[PDB]
Design a protein around this nucleic acid. Structure first.
Ligand SMILES: [Zn+2]
Lengths: 127, 50, 186, 134, 80, 28, 22, 188, 165
RNA sequence: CCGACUAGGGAUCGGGUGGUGUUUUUUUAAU
């Protein structure tokens, strides 16, 4: 499996089982940015990067507000004009959740990406 | 030393105790400050104890 | 500068003159020399800018003697300068009691009396010369540095010339004895 | 599958009781290698008796780099060499007695494992291409 | 029963497996022994895997076993 | 209970103390 | 103590020269 | 914010947002002093404020570890308490304008409430599934543990009679406890 | 004596006097001290103004320098009371460089963990954990370690011991 | 009743660490 996918799988089903903390290993910059944007929108609480010298561990604390993480496995390019279409086709509803993209300006959600007018490849979603 | 006790003329207020010590680092100083604050705050709630 | 202006112009207190001057004479034992050098500079400023200045000069003179007998002694030169600028600016009875303490102040007391013989009435000067002559006749290595300082300050010269080739015939003390004997030959 | 490996400490320093020299360790390393031990044996002897924890920490670099920079390079990597000699030991067992079908099966497994990392080492070109396992 | 993942207690962190801790690390150590023949300090691993010898006076100091190595009956050790 | 039956000095920690890992400004 | 009479560059070079010797 | 309230009929009006205090980092908890125009906000660091000045009067933080919750005392109103995400419970005093003493527990304190009838006792509600009744004058031991929850306790509160507490947790249930017992009197 | 071919500052003259006095107290040591030559003696202030002497080493010699760091730091604090005495080397990369700067900047007292807590406001708290070796001396110099590392790198990190405080 | 899935509980097999009692036992090896 991937390295973002099993981290998001742990952070998904741990919250489904109703835990208040996940430990996810290993940890990359893209995982830090994904948890960064989802705590910017308020889906997880704090999280902490314990640096062992191998790859890093994250302890996320998460309350109740998430209900699905994911990754879109072909990292196809989206456009600023088709951000609205891709959110319509993969989100649950109209203003429900965020598609998260790797852009020129880094990892951002879809509405921040179209706010500062930059497209990029898709990464994953959260709602 | 400065208190070698020379012959009898002692009309001055020369050297004795109460000099300035080397000051503690400010973490340890604020630690002792908040310990003193702890003891006086405990003495403030022990009046509700009755 | 701000603390000096506080000591000048503020109608003082119940006792803050004598209290903060107790702190003045006690703060030269602050165990960093970069700390007690500012105390020495405040002593310099308070003797640049009286009646009770005689008692303040007695306190500052005992304190400057104890700071001349310091640990690092890069500030003992500043204490010697402070003792000089307090003794040369003193009064009659103040310098008379200072000469009494100069004749008072074992081997550390001999080094203190050598520093006092370097410091300072021509009758008191001749009494200090007689005490230095008795010390040069009773001629460790602190007494040798005191005798080199006395030979730089200078019958008594005859006894010192009689002891100069004896002391010549610790290598910094040897260099000081060579300088004293060269001055004696000159 | 079991989890039984070694747990490298978080520190990367000499342990502050290691009063030996950073060069006498290298001299002991090249002495043991020239008297003829594999680098894993150098590491375990150095760890057990002359208590260097690990020599990538205490010396500059790892000990196969120390041996290659001091002239004692291996003909073939230690993994491939040990798997090669295990395969030829099973092959001589099989020529001795020919009803050991289980040992034939283990020979197929060992030969597959030979080809895997021989392919890896060949594409890295540690060992030259046109290398065959005889 | 229930435990915080980060900030775990030392009493439980010293009980669980050396890989299963928060940041892993060895529970082995090094200890210096003195040979009873010639009293010469040699430092030896705990899980020492080989029969180490005092290189001055060749006496066997430890014997390899499955886990820790055991020291040979007259030896004096000190953990460092 | 088994571990206490064997080992020598196992302190009886209270339930009311079993959840404090530490305290600044120690008590005498 | 353990073994090796092989596996090193200098060791197999010396045994190839030993084959050259005889 | 101000609210138009129909409780007295004495009078007869510009309801919302009379002022906007502003910090540089986020906030996480708030509680108001019960006199003297003062409140305190916890967050990246705990600040004290008053409703006249648009900036914090004082920063009262033990270390550089953030603060998750805050409660002022109800009598002896100048004693604050706070929960930091390093599993820490810190007491502050506002005479000395300083922290007072902290303890570190095993897991994270979600909430505090002070006893309104005993003025030095408080109850913490934390992530191992129970509540702890603590004396301010001796934080070396809890003077009760209220145990019956099965997931992380999210919030606690005292009865205004000071005789029982209510305690809602992450298992979707609340529990009421007599203060001298230590097990739940009732589950809703 | 220990400066390069530029003008030595008075701090360099004073610590060079400390080293020639330690060479005056030689013969208990046996030529372990000769090539111990500086690059610069920088001062770094703290929140209280109480500066810290960073002694620079070009690092072919920092190994033997911190082999006997603990004795000459105590002699150097005997010569300069109250002043913190730290040692330091000189510099892709720069993550390894700041790592080695931190590892040398702290005394040989063994960082045992690097946390970074990501808050909900978007802040981060970077934290280093120092373990056990003379904690009554380590907790005094925690904030001066913090101050000199912030001066060297810009990154503001927090030093803590896994103890009470 | 399936998996990408949380915790456990008792018993058992192989290894390891620690404890400190009984069977063991001693200056022949270790066990
Ligand atoms: Zn021996």
């Amino acid at each position: 499996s991937s390295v973002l996918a099993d981290a998001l799988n742990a952070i998904n089903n741990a919250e489904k089982t109703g835990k208040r903390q996940v430990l996810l290993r290993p940890s990359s910059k893209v995982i830090i940015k994904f948890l960064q944007v989802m705590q910017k929108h308020g889906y997880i609480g704090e999280f902490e990067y314990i640096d062992d010298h191998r790859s890093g561990k994250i302890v996320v604390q998460l309350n109740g507000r998430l209900n699905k993480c994911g990754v879109i496995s072909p990292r196809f390019n989206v456009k600023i004009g088709d951000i609205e279409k891709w959110t319509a086709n993969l989100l649950p509803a109209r203003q429900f959740g965020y598609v998260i993209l790797t852009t020129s300006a880094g990892i951002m959600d879809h509405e921040e990406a179209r706010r500062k007018h930059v497209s990029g490849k898709i990464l994953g979603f959260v709602y | 030393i400065d208190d070698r006790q020379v012959i009898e003329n002692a009309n001055l207020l020369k050297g004795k105790s109460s000099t300035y010590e080397v000051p503690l680092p400010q973490r340890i100083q604020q630690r002792h400050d908040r310990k003193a604050a702890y003891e006086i705050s405990r003495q403030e709630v022990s009046k509700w104890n009755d | 500068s701000v603390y000096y202006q506080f000591l000048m112009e503020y109608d003082q207190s119940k006792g803050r003159l004598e209290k903060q001057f107790k702190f003045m004479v006690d703060n030269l034992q602050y165990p960093t020399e970069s700390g007690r050098q500012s105390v020495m500079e405040l002593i310099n400023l308070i003797i640049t800018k009286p009646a009770l200045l005689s008692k303040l000069s007695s306190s500052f003179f005992l304190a400057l003697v104890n700071v001349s007998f310091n640990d690092d002694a890069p500030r003992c030169r500043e204490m010697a300068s402070v003792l000089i600028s307090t003794m040369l600016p003193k009064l009659e009875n103040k310098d008379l009691e200072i000469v009494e303490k100069y004749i008072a102040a074992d081997n550390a007391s001999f080094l203190n009396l050598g520093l006092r013989t370097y410091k300072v009435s021509i009758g008191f000067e001749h009494t200090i010369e007689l005490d230095e002559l008795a010390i040069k006749r009773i001629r460790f290595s602190s007494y040798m540095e005191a005798t080199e300082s006395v030979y730089k300050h200078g019958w008594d010269g005859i006894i010192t010339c009689l002891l100069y080739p004896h002391s010549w015939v610790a290598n910094l003390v040897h260099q000081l004895i060579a300088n004293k004997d060269k001055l004696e030959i000159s | 599958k079991g989890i039984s490996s070694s747990a490298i400490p978080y520190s990367r320093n000499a342990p502050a009781w290691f009063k030996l020299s950073s060069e006498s360790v290298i001299e002991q390393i090249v002495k043991y290698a020239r008297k003829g031990l594999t680098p894993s044996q150098i590491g375990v002897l150095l760890r057990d008796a002359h208590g260097v924890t690990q020599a990538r920490v205490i010396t500059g670099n790892k000990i196969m780099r120390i041996l290659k920079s001091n002239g004692l390079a291996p003909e073939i990597p230690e993994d491939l060499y040990y798997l090669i000699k295990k395969a030829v030991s099973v092959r001589k067992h099989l020529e001795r007695n020919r009803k050991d079908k289980d040992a034939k099966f283990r020979l197929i497994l060992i030969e597959s494992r030979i080809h895997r990392l021989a392919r890896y080492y060949r594409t890295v070109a540690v060992l030259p291409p046109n290398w065959k396992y005889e | 029963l229930v435990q915080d993942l980060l900030h775990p207690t030392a009493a439980s962190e010293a009980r669980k497996h050396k890989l299963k801790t928060l940041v892993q690390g060895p529970r082995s150590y090094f200890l210096d022994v003195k040979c009873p023949g010639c009293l010469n300090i040699t430092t030896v691993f705990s899980h020492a895997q080989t029969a180490v010898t005092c290189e001055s006076c060749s006496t066997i100091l430890c014997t390899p076993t499955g886990g820790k190595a055991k020291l040979s009956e007259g030896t004096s050790f000190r953990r460092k | 209970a088994n571990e206490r039956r064997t080992r020598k000095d196992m302190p009886y920690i209270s339930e009311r103390k079993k959840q404090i890992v530490g305290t600044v400004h120690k008590y005498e | 103590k353990k073994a090796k009479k092989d596996f090193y560059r200098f060791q197999v070079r010396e045994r190839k020269k030993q084959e050259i010797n005889q | 914010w101000s609210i138009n309230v129909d409780d007295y009929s004495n009078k007869n009006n510009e309801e919302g947002l009379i002022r906007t205090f502003d910090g540089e980092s986020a906030f996480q908890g708030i509680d108001s002093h019960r006199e003297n125009s003062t409140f305190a906000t916890g967050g990246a660091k705990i600040h004290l404020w008053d409703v006249n000045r648009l900036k914090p009067v004082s920063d009262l933080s033990w270390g550089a570890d953030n603060i998750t919750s805050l409660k002022f005392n109800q009598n002896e109103t100048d004693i604050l308490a706070s929960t930091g995400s390093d599993n820490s419970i810190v007491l502050y005093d506002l005479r000395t304008n300083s922290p007072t003493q902290k303890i570190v527990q095993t897991m994270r304190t979600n909430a505090i409430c002070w006893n309104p009838m005993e003025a030095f006792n408080f109850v913490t509600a934390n992530e191992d599934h129970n509540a702890y009744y603590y004396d301010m004058r001796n934080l070396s031991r809890s003077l009760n543990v209220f145990k019956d929850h099965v997931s992380a306790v999210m919030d606690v509160d005292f009865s205004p009679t000071g005789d029982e507490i209510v305690t809602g947790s992450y298992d979707k249930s609340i529990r009421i406890y007599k203060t001298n017992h230590g097990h739940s009197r009732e589950i809703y | 004596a220990k400066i390069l071919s530029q003008a030595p500052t008075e701090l360099e003259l004073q610590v060079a006097q400390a080293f020639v006095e330690l060479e005056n107290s030689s013969p208990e040591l046996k030529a372990e001290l000769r090539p111990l030559q500086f690059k610069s003696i920088r001062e770094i202030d703290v929140a209280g103004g109480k500066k810290a002497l960073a002694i620079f080493v070009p690092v072919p010699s920092l190994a033997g320098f911190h082999k006997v760091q603990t004795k000459l730091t105590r002699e150097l604090e005997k010569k300069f009371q109250d002043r913190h005495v730290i040692f330091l080397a000189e510099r892709r990369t720069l993550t390894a460089v700041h790592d080695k700067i931190l590892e040398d900047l702290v005394f040989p007292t063994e960082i045992v963990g690097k946390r970074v807590r990501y808050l909900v406001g978007g802040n981060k708290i970077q934290k280093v954990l120092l373990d056990s070796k003379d904690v009554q001396q380590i907790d005094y110099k925690l904030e001066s370690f913090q101050a000199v590392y912030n001066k060297l790198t810009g990154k503001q990190i927090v030093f803590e011991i896994p103890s009470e405080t």
